Amino acid sequence: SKGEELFTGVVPILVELDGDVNGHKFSVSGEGEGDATYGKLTLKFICTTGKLPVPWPTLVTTLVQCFSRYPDHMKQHDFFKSAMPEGYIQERTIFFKDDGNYKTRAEVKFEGDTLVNRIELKGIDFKEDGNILGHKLEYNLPDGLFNFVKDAGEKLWDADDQAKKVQEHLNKTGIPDADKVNIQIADGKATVTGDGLSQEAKEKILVAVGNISGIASVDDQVKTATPATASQFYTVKSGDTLSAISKQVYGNANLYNKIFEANKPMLKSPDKIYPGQVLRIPEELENVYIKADKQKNGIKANFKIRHNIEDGGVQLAYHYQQNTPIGDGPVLLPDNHYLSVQSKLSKDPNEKRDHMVLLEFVTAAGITLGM
Ligand SMILES: [K+]
């Protein structure tokens, strides 16, 4: 198990992708670094040929799982590092439901002190007005400033006494940790400041202040003691039901109670949603499932990605993966396990080329009972 030595600290990363999707050719270069002790990746990608013809999110999985955090009890199962520095070949087919597919072949290996991921991608059969080539997928979840339908929500005053009325509302309705934030109201703009809340507790506070009549935006100045993926925020439409919303955002109405619970105690029952109300849509988690493929000396994985569609819905991307070592030295062939991935996409306001900034955390784990 030599290869783990190479990952004990911060390691620079080069990524190069040459892609052609339905004859639309493009290239991507990536620079940054990974820290496998923390399963952490910090990378920025640039479309070097111009504008990217597909949504950036659809390329994330293709654009170095040797940087996954494998805890001590899991190191027996870390195929990815055991193949270093000679590396591995990583191949996938990605089936976008009701649309085209990507086929990818990548070489992942050290070149000097740098871990390099060189990729060839070919996409075919996509609908030129589909969600992919039509650029209908949301890039990321809005940060920092959240917008609400200004005149929707609880009526706390007619048209610091305003911020006082808000704080009393948060308290009276039972919003957890309302006593750990400070509210400021400036002409339809609320600023919420606080420290050491959960991601979930923060989100419930933000939504409860925004769902007040006369509040058009909420400035999230709240630090979470600990990150974690944010939820989607959904604006209720005339005619909506929680069941129909669930069908759109998750794919089935049978997850409607997931939305209801995630918006308690602000929301008292499924029938009390109203047009213009913002609701938290908690992530439906997807894991990466890995298995060994010994008579090929590597591993297989399967998983799916949920890509949010901008104007409502989810585009599923089914992934099937095979990894084969490049070197002939023995490698670790793991037991069945899974990886848990948290990813955040952002933009450099000063960058002018088509790009993607990526922050990612990945951890390994053993298959659970509920699985
Ligand atoms: K409002």
Residue numbers in the entry: 3 to 65, 69 to 164, 172 to 383
Task: Please share excerpts from the published article on this structure.
We have previously reported a prototype intensiometric K+ biosensor, designated GINKO1, based on the insertion of K+-binding protein (Kbp) into enhanced green fluorescent protein (EGFP). Genetically-encoded fluorescent K+ biosensors are promising tools to further improve our understanding of K+-dependent processes under normal and pathological conditions. The potassium ion (K+) is one of the most abundant cations across biological systems. Here, we report the crystal structure of a previously reported genetically-encoded fluorescent K+ biosensor, GINKO1, in the K+-bound state.
To better understand the K+-dependent fluorescence response mechanism of GINKO1 and facilitate further engineering, we determined the crystallographic structure of GINKO1 in the K+-bound state at 1.85 Å. Well-diffracting crystals of the unbound state were unattainable. The K+-bound crystal structure revealed the location and coordination geometry of the K+-binding site of Kbp, which was not apparent from the previously reported NMR structure. Notably, the K+ ion is coordinated via 6 backbone carbonyl oxygen atoms (from amino acids V154, K155, A157, G222, I224, and I227). The distances of coordinating carbonyl oxygens to K+ in GINKO1 range from 2.6 to 3.2 Å with a mean value of 2.8 Å, similar to those in KscA (2.70 to 3.08 Å, with a mean value of 2.85 Å), and valinomycin (2.74 to 2.85 Å). One difference is that K+ is coordinated via 8 oxygens from backbone carbonyls in both KcsA and TrkH, and 6 backbone carbonyls in Kbp. The structure further revealed that the K+ binding site is located in the BON domain, close to the interface between the BON and LysM domains. This is consistent with the previous finding that the BON domain binds K+ and the LysM domain stabilizes the K+-bound BON domain. We suspect that fusing Kbp to EGFP constrains the conformational mobility of Kbp, thus increasing the stability of Kbp protein for it to be crystallized as a domain in GINKO1. K356R, a mutation that doubled the fluorescence change ΔF/F0, is located at the interface of the Kbp and EGFP in the GINKO1 structure.
